[PDB]
Amino acid sequence: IPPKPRKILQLLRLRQINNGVFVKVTKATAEMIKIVEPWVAYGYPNLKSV
C-alpha cells in the first residue's frame, strides 16, 4: 500500500481488514475516503444497521 493511503487508513483507524468506523460526511472527510476507495467499501447506514 502506498504511504498516503496507508496514512489515511491509519487516521481513519482502519488498521485491519473488516474494521469499520462511523464518519461524519464533510468535504474534509469525503476527499480522504475518496482517496482510500481502492481499499474500502462505504455507504449510508440506516437505523437498524447503527
Partner: peptide, 8 residues
C-alpha cells in the same frame, strides 16, 4: 494482520 505504524 494489524497494521501498526506506531510501536507500543
Amino acid at each position: 494482520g494489524i497494521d501498526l505504524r506506531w510501536k507500543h
